[PDB]
Assembly symmetry: D6
Homo-oligomer: 164 residues x 12
């Protein structure tokens, strides 16, 4: 049994660890540096931010990951989606479930018209996970991000509600 | 023995659980997403908001639900009513008790002239529970809400004090 | 042994209970709805309010009630008096003692020239308890309040210092 | 032609003068002392106070008086009414018009159930003005106010909507 | 030539005049009382309120009215519409132009799915002006408002984008 | 024609001058140093201070002086009175009129039971001006103040309301 | 062994009790009403108030009373003195010691030129305690205070440093 | 002679006009609604925002347009570029000059590694103006925006510094 | 005719001119750098600072200098004195008048017991002006200050009230 | 006649223009972008900043330039010096005078022990102006700044008080 | 083994004890009165005050005293020094160690040019302890302080870095 | 196993110790004085400061040191690097690992173009530890700092990314 539940202050500890792991943040072009105090101040800052919906992917025993619908625009009705499953719990398909539930939330609850995401071109794993759900590559932004000491190309992929 | 009491800060932990259940919030067109900190900040924000009266529905042993009189207008003397009995305690008549007690509170204490509510046209259970108390359908707002990925119609039902006590 | 002391923050919980009992509040035309947080914010708000003196009525064992000198005007030298003894401790004469001590505080310490009160015209018990101390009815405000789904009249009663010393 | 219009900051000057006249304030048990700065701070303080409705009685040429519905309670549905016409403009029936318009506002707009007022027992003028409109004496509060160096009795009068 | 533009702080002087006219506010169940300072503080308060879009209706020479899209919900994708053309400029078709431009703004720019409004059941002028644009009566809320000392019913009318552009 | 009115912010400039004249302040044991900005901040500070009533004494043409009812205590019902007529307008009897009107304000409007004042034992002019109105010396505080490089004694004088009406 | 020590937040509990005793406050014309919260807010308010010096009179075992040098004026170099010994500990001369130490503080530390006090004319006890230390009656303010339902005369007494 | 300067508060009025023209905003997928007060508050809000560089495009006589380097990221070293020339001054080549100067600012002063932009797939004029400077289409985001009552696709175009120096 | 009056906000423009003259600030070991805004913020900061009494020295026609009693300690009853007469008005005896008036103010109004000052050991002009009034050298602080790129000694001079008036 | 005077709010207009000129800011590695509002907020922010001393170089008629002693450290007793003369007024030796006066201020008034500065290696003009006053090159920081689309080397030069 | 370390908030309890001892504060002309809350607020106030360096003097087992470098001026490069060793730990040479360590801190870390102090002319113990380290009497300020009900003279002593290390 | 992590508030205590050791700070020209409260306020102050990246150097068991990338400039793309390994854990090579990991962070994550540092010319150990990683001396700032009662020269050393990848 797996579920998605709103992010809570009490969970920031977990979110702290993830945000300070190099391997995880790198694949998503993030910086693996964030004090718990800064994370808590950011949680408080965006407490009423209706452009974001940060969730927690939880299995039958503990929290396993995070999934975020960010840049939620209510005029164009689209939003970016980000998924991060801790490598400790990779091996059990949590990413696909979290992705499906996040898509269902964005379309059926937030009434979004389109979802999009940026994925490292070399991250064929996540690329295939996304393609399985109906996401189609719409762009190839070359040298759009800098990580591991090099500029990396990123696929801009997306999915329309009409296609879902 | 059942009662309604004022919603307390200490009760938010329960309300939180209800505000994140998809099945519960859906029937009320709400969004099943709210951090405990957000709920607390909102409680603090509306602490002195006289347009709201959020009661907790409690039974002989523990809390069971929440009934709220919101959008209380004191010029037109009307307010919206919302009921949410946790499914764990469903089928015990708590909904009817809480709804009737809230009607009495609105008419006899708040001196309201009219009460109204929006109910999904498919929730015949709630429509019947409301009709039993005297609420009559006054409108059908088609595609008025959006839930479960579809636009849902809503009966605007209401009850007048004159119809409730003559 | 009975006494009156100043209302303390730590006492608010007791007050909270009283402020949510419909039976206690209705006779005083108040609304039986108040979260503990709202009561605490109100206590902090009026902490320096010199127009109010809220005393706790305590018996030999525990707190039994509340008395209040509100709307204290220092130019006209008068103030409204309110008393509430929890029904659990009713029938033991606490209300008369609290009324006497509050009158003494108003006249001898606050240097008030007059005390007044509103009492439901049907509440003959409180009316006689007040008349015993010399409070005389000076007005009949018809339909002055709304409670229990009906408009209620109220006696405006009062006692001058010149009548208290005579 | 006479009218009632919401009180404005720009009118406080007038309200200042009235509030510092002994003869006027005395009949209404008020204190004839108020700096313009204090009056402006009080106007700002009660800007969003929904328990009050302060108006201005204006004739065909200038402002003549003030009329206030205060202590507006929306549970018991009643409020106190106060009227003050500057003596310069006494002689033309402005008080009766202002009173009638204030009653109409309280009953037909604020949906009030009862209106009440305190009037000095010796103020037979205002007493008769009020009795003409249907107000009935409900109480005689003796020595309820102190002015001109003596305690004065005050009639508590009122009018129900059913009677109006 | 007629246009709708964003409401500006400098325009409040006009809005003030409209917010204190009994005849205008009555048909919209509003209260004809608002100090210029209150209106300014409210404008400042809702400056960043994305649930509102308050347009001023202007003609070839001067301002004539105000049309507002309020209660903009971005989940259910619906909003309420309100029109007020000053009587001085009535009978010139400004109301129809402003209403149609506001409908277009809501459907084509705000990406709204439905528009609705409350109209007094006696204001057949406004009911007809709204029916001409495609609005259909979806409800009759009896005694829903209180104005001119009487409880007034209100037609809940609405228009769907699907019905407006297919 | 002479009058007393409430102290206004616009009057502070006048006050400023008086508050920087050594001759005027020394007799009242004050310090002749006060920037206009400090006086304005003090006026704003005590704007809502109900313990003080600062009146301007105005003649037929211009402002001539200041009178003050300070340390107004509403439990003991007394207050200190202070008067200062600019030497430019001295000798015309303004001080006696201001004293009489201030006493009348304290007794008849503020409902004071007693008025008191401090006056330099050498200032026989002010002493006689006070004794004319019924103020009687109740104390001689020796070396109570320090001015002009010397410790100065002061008469504590006062007048009861019972003596003022008799 | 007796001592005087600066008033501390931790001692306000004691100061609370004293301030709510009718018999004690009455003799000093104070009002026997004060919540602990108000007392703490007042302590915080006057934390940096250099016009006051509030002490605590402590014996060999516990706190017994309070003594305050208030209205400290540094131009005229004088201040009012107030002493309150809890009746429980009356019987042991704590008031005389506290008074002497407060006088020594005012004169030798604060460099005051004169000390004064108000004492109820009927309080012959405190009057004699003060006269023993050299205080001389300088005034009789009749009906200066109101307590126990009556106006009471108060002796204004004082002591110069030159006389001490 | 044409130039680019920093956006000043005094310029906001001009911006205001541009930000309320439907024709100008629709092509950039913006909403043509913004009170002057909101624009001023936004200018003050982002005054210290180092992620944005908003320049005014000025000609020999007056201000003609705006250019903007927004979403400036200093880790990945890229930023979005936006340009708007008022239609009154269109056809004179101002847009190309502004684009060139903004690219030069981004690459030579901000040390950016890449610039990118969104442009409506139908706006062939802007597309060619961008392609002239070396911006190459890297993506086609279908139904990425909503304007004029229709979902619109957008080319994601961009230019690297290595292509600009080569 | 010469006088000393309280320093006013409006006077800062003059003080500014003096606070940026190297020759003036040097003899007083101050730094000849201070923006008008800094001077204004400092005036506002010390507005209620009772440890300072900053007088402006004025003549028959215009302002000429500034004399200040700073570091006013009310336990030890001593304060430092500083004089600055603008060179334009030098050689007219303004310094002696201002210094003597300040001494009188300190001893006779502030009730100070001792006055002191630091003076450069080379400024024999100031040393003599101070000795003429009774100030006696009590210390020689070598290399106590740093000005004109060199460490300068300073005479600590002082005057007792007992020595000034016996 | 030339002088240096403290920077004033009223002068920020001038400072605005200079700060938005590309040629000037480039030689000093600054960014030629600054709104007048931002400049005023920065002036207010550093109003009490004792680590800075910003002056204005003024000739017989108008303001000509700016000179700043920044990063004033009072432990190590050193500070950076920056000079900017508007090109309109280049041709009259204002830079040398401003530099000399700033050095005199830093050493003789601020009691500094050492002054230092960064100058573009290609800016032989300013380099020689500085060398004339006794400044000696202590370092060559290669690619220390980025301007005009290229990394530029900067001479770190300085002057001790003992050498001055 | 002895050391000096920065004063910590947790250390205030000790400092409090020293700030209320008459014998200790007297020799330093301080007032033996300070609530723990006042001391804490002052510590918080001067938390970022670079003019002060308050060290605690600790021994092998526990805290023993406090040594402070105050009035640190960074233009003239001088500061005042104050030592207070609790009498319980007197006669063990802690004063000399702390004073010498503070001198070293001022000259070698803070880069001060001169150190000075005020000492009661009767405290020959402290005068000798200071002379042993090189401090030389530079002034005699008579009646400069007031303690134990008498005006006390004070030696202004000081030490130059040039005299300490040549 | 050794690692670098982000500096946490809970780590400040460790930092506090290091920041009060004269031996550790002197080599980095810092002052060995800092209360824990000041360090906490500084951590909170720079919490959102993107110009700094303060890492803790941790070994297999406990925290051993600190490394810092400060003065991070994103236009010129450079930053200063600082390292401090507590002497207790010196000699185990932690400093070289921390330096390498910090350089990697600056170049590969922050995208820095150059790193630089100041090191005491006598600290040959740190100089060689830096030269091993490719840092080359670019300047000799003589008498650039003041510590241990003497002015000290410092090597300005640095490493480009082009040299790090080559």
């Amino acid at each position: 049994a797996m579920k998605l539940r709103a992010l809570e202050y009490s969970d920031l500890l977990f979110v702290h660890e993830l945000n300070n792991e190099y391997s995880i943040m790198s694949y998503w072009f993030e910086e693996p540096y964030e004090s718990l105090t800064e994370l808590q101040h950011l949680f408080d800052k965006h407490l009423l931010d209706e452009s974001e919906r940060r969730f927690i992917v939880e299995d039958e025993n503990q929290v396993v990951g995070i999934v975020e619908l960010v840049e939620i625009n209510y005029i164009h009705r689209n939003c970016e989606i980000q998924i991060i499953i801790k490598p400790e719990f990779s091996g059990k398909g949590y990413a696909k479930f979290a992705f499906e539930k996040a898509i269902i939330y964005a379309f059926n609850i937030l009434n979004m018209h389109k979802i999009y995401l940026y994925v490292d071109a070399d991250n064929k794993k996540a690329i295939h996970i996304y393609e399985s759900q109906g996401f189609k590559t719409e762009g190839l932004l070359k040298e759009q991000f800098y990580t591991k000491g090099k500029y990396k190309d990123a696929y801009f992929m997306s999915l329309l509600k009409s296609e879902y």
